[PDB]
Amino acid sequence: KLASEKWGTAKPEVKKAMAPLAAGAAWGLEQWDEIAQYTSVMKSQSPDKEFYDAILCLHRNNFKKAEVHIFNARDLLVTELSALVNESYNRAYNVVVRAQIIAELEEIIKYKKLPQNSDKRLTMRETWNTRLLGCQKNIDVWQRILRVRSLVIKPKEDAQVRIKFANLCRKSGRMALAKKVLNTLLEETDDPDHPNTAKASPPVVYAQLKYLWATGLQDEALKQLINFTSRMAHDLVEDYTKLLARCFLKQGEWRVCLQPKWRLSNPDSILGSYLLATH
Amino acid sequence: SSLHYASYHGRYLICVYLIQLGHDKHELIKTFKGNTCVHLALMKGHEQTLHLLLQQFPRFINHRGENGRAPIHIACMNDYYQCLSLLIGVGADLWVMDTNGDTPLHVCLEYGSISCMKMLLNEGDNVRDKGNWKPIDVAQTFEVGNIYSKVLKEV
Amino acid sequence: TTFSTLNLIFDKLKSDVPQERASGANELSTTLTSLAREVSAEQFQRFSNSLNNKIFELIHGFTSSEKIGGILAVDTLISFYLSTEELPNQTSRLANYLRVLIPSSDIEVMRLAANTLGRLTVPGGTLTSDFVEFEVRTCIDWLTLTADNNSSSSKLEYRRHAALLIIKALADNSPYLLYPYVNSILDNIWVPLRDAKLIIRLDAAVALGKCLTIIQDRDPALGKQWFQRLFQGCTHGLSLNTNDSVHATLLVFRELLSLKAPYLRDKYDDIYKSTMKYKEYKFDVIRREVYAILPLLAAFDPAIFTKKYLDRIMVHYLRYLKNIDMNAANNSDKPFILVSIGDIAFEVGSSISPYMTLILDNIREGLRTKFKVRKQFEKDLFYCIGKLACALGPAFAKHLNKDLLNLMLNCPMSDHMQETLMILNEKIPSLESTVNSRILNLLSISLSGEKFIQSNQYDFNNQFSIEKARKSRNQSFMKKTGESNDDITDAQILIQCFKMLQLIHHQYSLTEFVRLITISYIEHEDSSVRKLAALTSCDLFIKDDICKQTSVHALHSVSEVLSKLLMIAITDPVAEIRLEILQHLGSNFDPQLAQPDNLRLLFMALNDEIFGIQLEAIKIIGRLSSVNPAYVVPSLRKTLLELLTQLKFSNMPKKKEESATLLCTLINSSDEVAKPYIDPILDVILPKCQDASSAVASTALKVLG
Asked: What further fact does the record state (chain B)?
């Protein structure tokens, strides 16, 4: 909506104040299509729009639109850090190394162009996605896979690389849980949702459930654990992890419902209900 | 391929076929010549294929290829059937130009296709080439007069 | 052998014209120690470069074959042998090479004083080694020396250009290094100003305004230099023009005003209103070009038309016959014209009247009938003037061609086709780019079915040796892009022609077929006329060994049909297999075999043994690892091209024969150079293809490590 204000500001200078917003709205706002007018009402010249010039090889077919931004990038970034860049030396490790995660990712959406089709191709990519898990696991998973997981298909590719990253969001503050689970409780697939179609993933449901003490709801949970001890506890691939987040919710859901109770007489029948929780 | 192949049998249930297969619309691989949906079909002529293609594939803008001529100069390259009434049933914007800057009138008059100012004046001097050559100067530059005399009719 | 039986075969002449036995037996004696100025243990070239090289100070040759080995001696001790620029190349190229140079035989000044040009080795110690020992030879050589020594002019002039590539590209390596840029230009410009070489004195003052403006200074230093531009521009008053031969002195000032100089805008107007006389005045062959080069960069529009009119007032009036060494002297690129070409460079077409290239358009259908008794067609400046433009539409620009089309056709001529293709491009009516291309010259024309076999259908006029009509006919068939023409009429007038028109003899034409036949064709989808015939055609590259060099030409069709391959190879397939044990026979060339088609081979999957015919050559190497010293020259390169193919073989480990070849490729990770590390990559492209290097984590990790 700023787009007309976001220009209504510019004019040379404020085109550097269209930067951090729309360089994140160019990919930011689902569509790459704001790069069209963006890449030429902002930089062809910065390292930022030289890396971003490449992506229209991805989004067409003509590799030159990636190309000299292997070699641009391989220089834009030995350059940026050469002098003191170490691994625990804090001012590395995380911008310069995200600006290098630019570089050894030229060869990587170019494999979902190069190798085709049925191949180790998913398992290699699985791999490109376990081998990405690396150098450790956190925060800014998104300036990165915001544009990287545009690797031919989004939670329908792997909702379990996410919403473990929406367990990073879950666990982070709800700007990082909510906005996510505003289009990741969309799944990307599945009415308010059906008590059978969200039978899609009890895990999206535990992305909705840990979320339903964020959403406060105890008695809909508790309804959903009641829908997980009557109707997946009747459902006796997804059916083996079930006991791993299902008695785990006859504790950690049953936990801060036992909160006025807790002693002597108040876990009595809530002894199991406790029984299964662990035994 | 395994989809841009039936673009070259333009067939339009072979295209209702590779629906169940649904590849991306305007071929998923656009060919690196920018032989897209019709930019491939219009570069090979096939309307029956430019009607089920606006239907499938009508997508966003489209593009340059990297030929610099979108498909509405590759349609003149195989004179695509009813592409005068199709680029009109699609908003094809009208400019649109080949590699000069000239709109493909000031391509098809350097042809002098009398046709390709026949569908052309049916669209409705004022197209100019890399160096400001009026349609009118790139038909006086080929002496291409069956277009210059259909550029007198248009003054 | 003791590169000294191949460095004595260049030392001394060992005929009337070596240098061809000096570029084979310093190009088969320097790319064989393989090493640099780091072989001293090169005193095995390099004393038989200091013995070369005295037998390069004594003879030099009287043809320059101890001079071109003199320049292939010291071009194999400046850059190849690497530690060169100040210890044994400023000692022994001023001890070769200045000792050879007081005298010069045949142009030692461009052989060994203009080698002392391209050493580029220290621009101040080349400014007291080569400018304080070259200003003693340029200075008792501006004048000759011992009149033999009568070539010290020669050795003026190509030495004075040449320490002015060392006031250029060493003292540009310092674009302020002051030669005395103003003062010794007065000498130089008075003491080869005579009638010596008057055309090589100039290039050292085309060096010292183009090395005084690199010294940009063009306002207080080419204005300290505007008298000695205003002694060179007076040198006509000053020396008349019959005293001290004023011709190429009147060709430096007028050549650096046109460049810069703060004087060309003040001299148009000054030394045009000198030489518009001096061109028209004696007619001189040096006073075409005292004029020529001033209006050529005076053109801007201020430099009046009193620039355009006099090279049209020498065109009309001093007879067109003025190309005058004499009144007829070979019908050619008239010498005004050889001024107004960089002048019409420099102006758009449809703006001058186009009657400034139609007074010339009658002197060239005049000229089209002129060289008919001479060359029998010159047209080379009609084409540099035809850049200009095309004008008019095709009002003139429909006729300024049917004429030139009849120019390069009737008697025996071609090579104008090498200039008539660039303007054939810029045209927005393609029109005669499509008309010249149905001439095709001899017999070969469109429309065909039976009777292609003659190719002795020749055009006469000035009759033929059919060898000049060899490379003067195949030069239409060499320029072409695979635009249009038929398979029957191009491929079968040319399956008729190209099979024989290659043999006899070499590749003259065949550099067009395999090129403009997979540029022209396939697809080509059922022509069973062109399946088992593109097979007939592919099986002239079995003996592409008609010459074992132009087999590089099938190595370039082998780094060429890498596309056309599979759908002319599933109805081969036993004569491929044969064309396969041909990659397996040859590529013989690039040490010994398999390489240029390495990846071209391994496409032929969904076929045969391809896995195994390549498995046996794999181990057959393994046991050559070479390093097994059993490779003495090339197997290292086959092992490793080997190997380089195995990278591209990308398929099977024959697990028990990938780890065991990897059980040498880590012994090989010891000794020699940049070889055995190409050798794990070339495996590791097909990683150990398990999902991990079983056990090679660590055995990579201490090789990594």
From this structure: Present with 1180 molecules/cell in log phase SD medium.
